[PDB]
C-alpha cells in the first residue's frame, strides 16, 4: 500500500459519498478508475518518490 | 480530465464542503506536472515495447 494512492483513493471516496447528482457520481467513479488504473500508479509513485 | 476535478471541486464548495479544495487541487497540479506526464509517457513506451517482446515470443 503506497499512502499517497490511499490517501487520494480516500479522498475520492469521501467525494463519492458526499455528491449524490448524477454527473458527480460519473464523475467521481472515473476518477477512481484513473486512480485504480496500475499505469496511473507507476507514474504517481515515481513522481512523487522524486519530489 | 481537468474538467472534472474543476466540476467536483465547485460542487464540494456549493455543498459546504471544502474538506477536498487542496486534495483536489494537488490531484490537478499533479496531472498537469511536466515530469509526471514525461514520466507517464515514458512508462507506456516501454509498456508498449514490453508487450512487442511478448508478442515475438510465440
Known amino acids: 500500500q503506497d499512502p499517497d494512492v490511499e490517501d487520494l483513493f480516500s479522498s475520492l ?3 463519492q459519498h458526499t455528491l449524490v447528482d448524477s454527473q458527480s457520481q460519473e464523475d467521481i467513479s472515473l476518477l477512481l478508475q484513473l486512480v485504480q488504473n496500475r499505469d496511473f500508479q507507476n507514474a504517481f509513485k515515481i513522481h512523487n518518490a522524486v519530489t | 480530465v481537468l474538467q472534472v476535478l474543476d466540476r467536483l471541486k465547485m460542487k ?10 487542496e486534495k483536489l487541487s494537488m490531484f490537478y497540479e499533479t496531472l498537469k506536472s511536466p515530469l509526471f506526464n514525461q514520466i507517464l509517457t515514458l512508462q507506456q513506451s516501454i509498456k508498449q515495447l514490453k508487450g ?3 508478442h515475438i515470443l510465440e
Open chain 1, 13 to 15: 471516496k469521501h467525494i
Open chain 2, 12 to 21: 464540494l464548495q456549493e455543498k459546504g464542503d471544502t474538506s477536498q479544495n
Open chain 2, 52 to 54: 512487442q517482446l511478448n
